[PDB]
Design a protein around this ligand. Structure first.
Ligand SMILES: Nc1nc2c(ncn2[C@@H]2O[C@@H]3COP(=O)(O)O[C@H]4[C@@H](O)[C@H](n5cnc6c(=O)[nH]c(N)nc65)O[C@@H]4COP(=O)(O)O[C@H]3[C@H]2O)c(=O)[nH]1
Ligand SMILES: Nc1nc2c(ncn2[C@@H]2O[C@@H]3COP(=O)(O)O[C@H]4[C@@H](O)[C@H](n5cnc6c(=O)[nH]c(N)nc65)O[C@@H]4COP(=O)(O)O[C@H]3[C@H]2O)c(=O)[nH]1
Lengths: 181, 181
């Protein structure tokens, strides 16, 4: 009985399933983004092991060297779920310094369902202990992997990024951007 | 291992936990709503047994006699989750005919996590059969009841409304509005 399973299926069907196949095309709608080299087009989904964040990524405790900068948003994608509610999905583009080289552009986002794990652990510790929360993060990670890997339209469109609150996200992102296709 | 459990906890922590305690007060910000009698202030959360809806409630297959009318929206509530994302929550007010009497106003909303159950059953039948979906609706209902009933701030602020696709929502709502305190 894993609360993370529902969190992963809902993250997919209520969001990723339709934003991931279109992400590259949405990005391509902006001339600046068409012109930019070193712009990896995958959604980097951030999964901090403590299920927590409280600020903008640039200059945050995860960016101690201040190497991450908000660049702008992608062109909104429209989607209608249920038949009644029109929703607009857009993503934040960040610039990540690469020493004296050309800086990278990338798409980064926290996995928002992790806030529920965090909220649960604080408001209902009897339901989710700290150690049970740690474990549900892993369950969440593995299930989301299975779901996304089972969808051919999502192949190559994302990368899950797990890290400890002590890690430097700029360092983590630089390695993942360099290793991207 | 019930996918519905995760769906219910996130529906709560990502939405209901903060909209339900404030709903009556948000409604009271509009003079028309302060002036209106027979305006039950609870959120009526709609849980169709088939996990499905494809249109506006007024005049829908659930409103065969056309007794439900969209009246307007509540004043948005602002909330910041994560520290980074400002969100605006608002709700639809509907008028429901009561014969020759003064019509009711009420707040009605489909439980959006049910779409994930629906989407799963159609896209991944191997993961969720039709009969398994039926069962997850019941699990979802009972878990959401436990969660909401455990939060004193949500007491008296909602009502879960379960119905078959053959039911007349206007009749169902009328009985529940008359039975409200
Ligand atoms: N980083 C981040 N960004 C998010 C998130 N959710 C929405 N956004 C984005 O923020 C924009 C405005 O959010 P809003 O102020 O709450 O204002 C929203 C909200 O009041 C409402 N809304 C949002 N989700 C739902 C839903 O599931 N059902 C219904 N009935 N209304 C919704 O419609 C308004 C506009 O919707 P959108 O066009 O899609 O535009 C959304 C959407 O592009 C999130 O969880 N994380
Ligand atoms: N970055 C980003 N992620 C998105 C966006 N839309 C959906 N997601 C992700 O998909 C998850 C589940 O979306 P949901 O099925 O609509 O299921 C939601 C929905 O049923 C309900 N909910 C949340 N916000 C609203 C709202 O504004 N209006 C209504 N009617 N329901 C809402 O709470 C459920 C869980 O909410 P979450 O914890 O936020 O979890 C969200 C969120 O993690 C988005 O625009 N931007």
């Amino acid at each position: 009985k894993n609360v993370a399973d529902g969190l992963a299926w809902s993250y997919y069907f209520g969001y990723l399933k339709f934003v991931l196949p279109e992400l590259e095309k949405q990005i391509e709608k902006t001339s600046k983004f068409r012109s930019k080299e070193k712009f990896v087009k995958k959604m980097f989904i951030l999964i901090p092991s403590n299920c927590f964040w409280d600020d903008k990524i640039p200059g945050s405790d995860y960016d101690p060297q201040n190497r991450i900068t908000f660049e702008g948003n992608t062109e909104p994608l429209e989607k209608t779920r249920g038949g009644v509610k029109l929703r607009h999905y857009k993503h934040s583009v960040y610039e990540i310094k690469d020493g004296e080289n050309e800086p990278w552009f990338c798409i980064m986002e926290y996995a928002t369902p992790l806030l529920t794990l965090y909220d649960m652990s604080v408001a209902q510790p009897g339901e989710l202990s700290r150690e049970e929360r740690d474990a549900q993060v892993v369950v969440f990670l593995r299930k989301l992997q299975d779901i996304l890997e089972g969808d051919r339209a999502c192949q190559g469109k994302y990368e899950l990024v797990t890290f400890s609150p002590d890690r430097d996200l700029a360092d983590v992102m630089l390695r993942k951007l360099k290793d991207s296709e």
